[PDB]
Structure 1
């Protein structure tokens, strides 16, 4: 389960916006998204880094469910 699968599910518009700024590698293996990329992703989507942090957290929570849900 990854961002691709999370993407496949207004607050919803921005979320997409954040994911539409990542590379394929980032979507498939989210844990590689650190300081420099979050920043690339936030500016690239007109969002704040903390916006990206929340997005990744909501994704994390779900990724946890997949295997225990």
Structure 2
């Protein structure tokens, strides 16, 4: 279960904007995304790093709730 998936699922259009600013590898291995990449993605989708982390925060809980069934 990756971010390509999480995508298939005003605050929603902005949640796509962010993933839309990532690369295939970042969607395939979210963990590889540290500060530098966060920065690239925030500016790339007119957001703020906090916003991204937020989106990253969600996927994590969503993924975590995927390793429980």
Aligned-residue offset at 1:58: 0.3
Structure 1 gap segments, 5+ residues each: none
**Per the alignment, in what secondary structure is the counterpart of residue 47 of structure 2?**
coil
TM-score by length of 1: 0.97
Aligned-residue offset at 1:2: 1.0
TM-score by length of 2: 0.97
Aligned-residue offset at 1:10: 1.2
Q: Could you list the per-position Cα deviations for residues 5-28 of structure 1 after superposition, in whole angstroms to 9, with x for gaps in the alignment? A: 100001000000000000000001
Aligned length: 69
Aligned-residue offset at 1:67: 2.1
> Which segments of structure 1 move beyond 2 Å, counting only runs of 4 or more?
none
Aligned-residue offset at 1:54: 0.3
Q: Could you list the per-position Cα deviations for residues 5-52 of structure 1 after superposition, in whole angstroms to 9, with x for gaps in the alignment? A: 100001000000000000000001000010000000000000000000
**Per the alignment, in what secondary structure is the counterpart of residue 10 of structure 1?**
coil
Mapped to 2, the partners of 1:4 and 1:65 lie a distance apart of 17
